[PDB]
Amino acid sequence: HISLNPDLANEDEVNSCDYWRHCAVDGFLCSCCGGTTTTCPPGSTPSPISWIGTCHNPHDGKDYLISYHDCCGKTACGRCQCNTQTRERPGYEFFLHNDVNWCMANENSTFHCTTSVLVGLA
Amino acid sequence: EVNSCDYWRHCAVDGFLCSCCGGTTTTCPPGSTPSPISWIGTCHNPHDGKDYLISYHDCCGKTACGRCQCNTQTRERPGYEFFLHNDVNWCMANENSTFHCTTSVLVGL
Amino acid sequence: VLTGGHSVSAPQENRIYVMDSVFMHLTESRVHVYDYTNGKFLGMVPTAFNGHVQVSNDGKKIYTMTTYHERITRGKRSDVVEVWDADKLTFEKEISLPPKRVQGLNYDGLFRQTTDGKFIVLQNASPATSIGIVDVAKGDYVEDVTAAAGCWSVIPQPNRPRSFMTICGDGGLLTINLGEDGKVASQSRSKQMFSVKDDPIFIAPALDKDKAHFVSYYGNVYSADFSGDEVKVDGPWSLLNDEDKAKNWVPGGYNLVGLHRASGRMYVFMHPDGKEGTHKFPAAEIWVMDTKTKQRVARIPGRDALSMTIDQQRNLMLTLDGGNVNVYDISQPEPKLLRTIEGAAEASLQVQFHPV
Amino acid sequence: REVLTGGHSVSAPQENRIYVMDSVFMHLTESRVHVYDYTNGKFLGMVPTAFNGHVQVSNDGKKIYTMTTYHERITRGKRSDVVEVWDADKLTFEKEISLPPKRVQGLNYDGLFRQTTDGKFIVLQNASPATSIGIVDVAKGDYVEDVTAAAGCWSVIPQPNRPRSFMTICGDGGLLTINLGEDGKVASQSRSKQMFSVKDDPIFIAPALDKDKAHFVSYYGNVYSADFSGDEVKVDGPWSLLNDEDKAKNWVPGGYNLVGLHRASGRMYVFMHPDGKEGTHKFPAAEIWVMDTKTKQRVARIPGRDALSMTIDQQRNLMLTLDGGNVNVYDISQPEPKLLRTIEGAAEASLQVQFHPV
Numbered sequence: 028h029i030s031l032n033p034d035l036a037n038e039d040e041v042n043s044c045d046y047w048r049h050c051a052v053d054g055f056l057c058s059c060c061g062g063t064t065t066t067c068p069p070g071s072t073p074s075p076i077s078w079i080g081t082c083h084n085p086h087d088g089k090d091y092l093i094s095y096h097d098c099c100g101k102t103a104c105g106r107c108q109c110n111t112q113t114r115e116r117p118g119y120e121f122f123l124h125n126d127v128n129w130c131m132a133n134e135n136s137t138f139h140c141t142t143s144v145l146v147g148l149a
Numbered sequence: 150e151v152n153s154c155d156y157w158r159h160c161a162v163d164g165f166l167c168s169c170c171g172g173t174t175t176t177c178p179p180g181s182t183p184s185p186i187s188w189i190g191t192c193h194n195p196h197d198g199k200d201y202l203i204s205y206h207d208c209c210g211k212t213a214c215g216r217c218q219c220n221t222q223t224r225e226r227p228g229y230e231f232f233l234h235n236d237v238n239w240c241m242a243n244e245n246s247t248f249h250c251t252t253s254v255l256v257g258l
Numbered sequence: 259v260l261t262g263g264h265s266v267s268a269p270q271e272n273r274i275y276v277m278d279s280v281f282m283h284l285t286e287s288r289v290h291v292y293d294y295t296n297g298k299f300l301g302m303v304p305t306a307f308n309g310h311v312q313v314s315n316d317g318k319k320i321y322t323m324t325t326y327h328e329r330i331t332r333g334k335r336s337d338v339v340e341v342w343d344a345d346k347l348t349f350e351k352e353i354s355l356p357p358k359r360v361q362g363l364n365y366d367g368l369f370r371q372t373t374d375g376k377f378i379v380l381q382n383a384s385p386a387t388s389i390g391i392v393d394v395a396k397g398d399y400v401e402d403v404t405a406a407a408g409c410w411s412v413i414p415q416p417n418r419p420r421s422f423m424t425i426c427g428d429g430g431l432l433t434i435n436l437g438e439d440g441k442v443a444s445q446s447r448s449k450q451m452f453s454v455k456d457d458p459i460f461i462a463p464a465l466d467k468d469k470a471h472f473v474s475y476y477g478n479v480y481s482a483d484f485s486g487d488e489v490k491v492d493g494p495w496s497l498l499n500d501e502d503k504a505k506n507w508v509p510g511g512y513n514l515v516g517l518h519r520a521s522g523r524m525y526v527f528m529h530p531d532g533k534e535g536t537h538k539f540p541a542a543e544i545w546v547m548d549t550k551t552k553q554r555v556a557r558i559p560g561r562d563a564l565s566m567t568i569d570q571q572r573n574l575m576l577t578l579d580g581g582n583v584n585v586y587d588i589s590q591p592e593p594k595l596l597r598t599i600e601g602a603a604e605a606s607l608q609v610q611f612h613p614v
Numbered sequence: 615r616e617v618l619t620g621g622h623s624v625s626a627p628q629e630n631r632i633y634v635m636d637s638v639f640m641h642l643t644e645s646r647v648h649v650y651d652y653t654n655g656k657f658l659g660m661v662p663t664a665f666n667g668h669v670q671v672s673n674d675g676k677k678i679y680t681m682t683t684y685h686e687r688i689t690r691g692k693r694s695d696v697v698e699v700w701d702a703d704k705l706t707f708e709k710e711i712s713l714p715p716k717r718v719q720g721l722n723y724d725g726l727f728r729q730t731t732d733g734k735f736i737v738l739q740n741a742s743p744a745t746s747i748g749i750v751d752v753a754k755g756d757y758v759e760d761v762t763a764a765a766g767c768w769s770v771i772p773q774p775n776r777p778r779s780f781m782t783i784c785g786d787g788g789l790l791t792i793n794l795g796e797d798g799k800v801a802s803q804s805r806s807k808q809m810f811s812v813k814d815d816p817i818f819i820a821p822a823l824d825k826d827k828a829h830f831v832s833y834y835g836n837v838y839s840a841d842f843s844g845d846e847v848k849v850d851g852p853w854s855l856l857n858d859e860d861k862a863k864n865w866v867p868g869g870y871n872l873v874g875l876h877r878a879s880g881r882m883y884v885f886m887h888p889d890g891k892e893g894t895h896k897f898p899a900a901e902i903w904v905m906d907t908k909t910k911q912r913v914a915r916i917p918g919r920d921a922l923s924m925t926i927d928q929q930r931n932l933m934l935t936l937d938g939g940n941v942n943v944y945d946i947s948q949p950e951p952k953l954l955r956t957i958e959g960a961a962e963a964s965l966q967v968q969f970h971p972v
């Protein structure tokens with residue numbers, strides 16, 4: 028249960044690409060960009076849409092649905108770039124696909140960083 | 150030799166050498182526009198032991214070439230000697246001011 | 259010799275196009291133009307946010323696709339196709355698109371053209387998917403193919419003037435045949451080629467004149483034949499022998515395959531120790547498969563390549579690791595490395611030859 | 615289970631914040647300001663600034679001001695030069711103020727984008743390439759005055775002892791002082807006697823600025839001063855930064871924003887390197903020298919860590935230095951500075967760092 032809350036973890040753990048919930052992240056971790064795992068950096072806007080990953084939590088042995096909502100409308104954060112691809116699939120499975128910009132439907136589609144939001148059990 | 154920042158004519162270049170960007174020492178790469186204005190350098194020619202005026206007309210209206218970046222400052226002076234100064238964009242008066250690369254044109258002694 | 263107004267210094271037949279996403283500064287993407295024979299940088303075309311690029315079939319123009327906003331990070335959006343002169347590398351014409359062009363990594367299939375060169379065919383996502391048709395001559399967006407919803411990417415048919423296929427979520431292919439005006443005249447859907455859940459394919463085709471081959475996450479090969487009126491599908495056959503399987507060799511990359519049409523050789527980026535999540539890993543090796551005999555005829559070091567492209571006439575393969583471009587002679591079954599162009603890009607997953 | 619939210623403010627208090635202006639010269643159309651916490655090196659946020667942005671913080675600490683250039687299609691189309699006002703805590707865009715299309719495009723010297731001491735006017739350098747100073751009225755959100763009197767001059771040095779006065783350095787080796795009226799137009803002006811020989815002893819434009827005087831260092835290691843305690847600026851100098859041992863190794867200043875003044879102590883900080891000669895005026899610092907400006911003597915010297923630009927916080931007795939990519943934080947409460955930490959990878963190409971005002 029403690030491993031389900033990134034805010035209680037060591038910052039060096041959550042800012043790493045191998046942190047369990049970052050398993051299908053292609054972009055910059057918002058937690059390194061002035062935000063947190065679940066909050067956009069100041070002045071960047073959440074995407075209403077996202078791709079979704081299924082990630083294993085090795086701390087509790089369960090598998091979880093993770094929504095990779097972007098933060099948008101600022102230029103590239105440039106920090107903590109990750110490119111993990113667990114259970115990622117091509118564009119013919121569009122909401123499992125991370126080689127597209129999930130800021131695409133925002134008022135400003137410039138990609139700033141990516142968050143890893145816990146939806147629930149897979 | 151001409152693609153090196155140590156080439157004698159490049160003595161007051163702060164930018165990318167156009168000769169590495171699809172142009173030459175005296176010509177703009179395709180689709181980049183020469184600046185009508187420029188800063189001027191005074192550079193020592195080691196072959197005849199003489200000093201020459203070199204005009205650094207930029208090529209403009211394309212984004213940064215990124216190749217052969219040089220930052221040489223021989224006889225360069227601050228903005229109160231404006232046409233000797235290279236910390237400003239000499240594309241500043243072009244129809245599009247985006248800086249692409251710098252040429253090094255021999256004017257005279 | 260005048261100061262401006264110059265054309266590219268090397269002949270068209272020497273030119274290649276490295277699409278640099280510049281992902282760290284994605285609003286300043288650009289196309290770098292190189293001479294593959296000597297590695298000389300020949301020029302570039304700016305492409306703003308996440309540009310895509312292709313060269314017109316006739317070799318005369320460069321087409322880009324990009325997104326602008328009035329104040330970049332705010333203000334009104336403009337999605338466009340741009341037409342540039344291939345020799346002068348100068349802007350000619352903007353063609354307005356609806357504000358849903360695909361923003362994504364540079365797979366060839368997101369931005370293509372018909373065989374006859376008369377239409378640009380591009381992928382949209384709003385995030386609902388459709389395929390857009392642009393009439394080059396008219397400079398107009400003319401048709402939104404919403405029939406392609408649930409599908410992804412464009413595979414032109416080199417045996418027809420204005421037909422293409424797309425890969426759909428049912429594991430099949432949708433063919434679209436355009437009329438003279440660019441509106442959809444007819445369409446057809448194949449039977450299931452691959453299992454989406456059990457053996458997903460990479461989208462990149464190894465494309466022949468009337469057939470296309472595809473590789474899968476687990477090292478299988480599928481094909482689509484479009485010599486007939488309707489597409490016929492088959493597969494799988496495996497890329498892997500028993501030794502390969504025991505070492506868990508699988509494909510990995512982006513534009514990860516190619517076909518040398520004269521010989522039927524297919525080129526594929528491969529890596530060992532494949533498991534879930536390794537499908538975009540750089541190449542440990544390039545494998546060369548004879549698609550008729552279904553046997554591997556060569557394996558060579560991959561130089562960490564991610565994308566490739568083939569030139570038929572000169573028997574050439576280019577590979578690209580994100581920043582460096584490798585040039586191979588593929589006239590014989592075993593490729594030979596001719597040279598490497600270091601620092602051709604900061605973040606490129608696509609390279610293309612000028613058509614000859 | 616969770617939902618992503620925006621609308622958040624900068625996590626660390628204003629007193630912790632510094633602003634690193636990253637030109638991103640290799641991709642200069644995507645310059646930006648990086649906001650850092652100097653106490654721990656944490657990245658707090660950023661403000662995009664398009665082509666060759668410049669930045670400052672409002673004197674009251676509430677707003678960030680940027681200056682930049684846009685075009686309708688970036689590399690073609692109509693040009694728009696602007697000042698933007700952003701909220702300091704939310705790092706959100708609030709307003710754009712239009713400028714004539716001649717704002718200076720250049721490296722981020724402090725003196726290209728400043729404000730009057732009362733914070734009521736933004737004062738910026740224009741180049742068309744003829745030079746003038748532009749005045750922006752903050753209350754009105756409008757450009758209100760082109761100071762063409764400053765033709766042949768460069769950079770803006772605000773006078774901290776007057777509400778709406780500033781100086782500029784002219785091609786005659788003197789200073790032009792401009793006193794604005796409440797409407798932001800020129801109320802009066804005056805020109806000093808020659809301070810330095812432009813040909814023989816050119817100064818760096820960066821001031822070491824006190825309440826009522828400014829010091830400048832020269833290419834050859836001399837110091838000049840402009841006293842504006844009164845209505846007419848009185849100029850003096852040179853005195854030399856160098857003692858006899860220093861002359862042997864040809865020590866000279868080098869950098870961009872290369873000097874600073876700790877006003878309470880009168881200590882001036884200067885980046886220096888040995889083996890000075892023609893063309894070395896922008897070389898990275900081999901050392902930082904600390905000069906008592908009253909006694910005209912060096913009181914300390916420390917390794918420079920290849921720094922090019924600096925800034926000083928008076929209240930907390932701090933100096934930041936910057937080598938292009940990394941920021942060093944020093945305690946300058948005593949004559950010899952003490953290195954506290956280095957923030958690595960703060961920028962790709964920055965020649966300017968500034969504190970949030972406290």
Ligand SMILES: NCc1ccc(Cl)cc1
Pocket residue numbers: 053054125126127128129138308361362363
């Ligand atoms: N999911 C990362 C990403 C951002 C932008 C673009 Cl264009 C493509 C992929």
Ligand SMILES: NCc1ccc(Cl)cc1
Pocket residue numbers: 163164235236237238239248666719720721
């Ligand atoms: N002379 C190079 C240069 C270009 C642009 C800017 Cl903004 C500054 C310097």
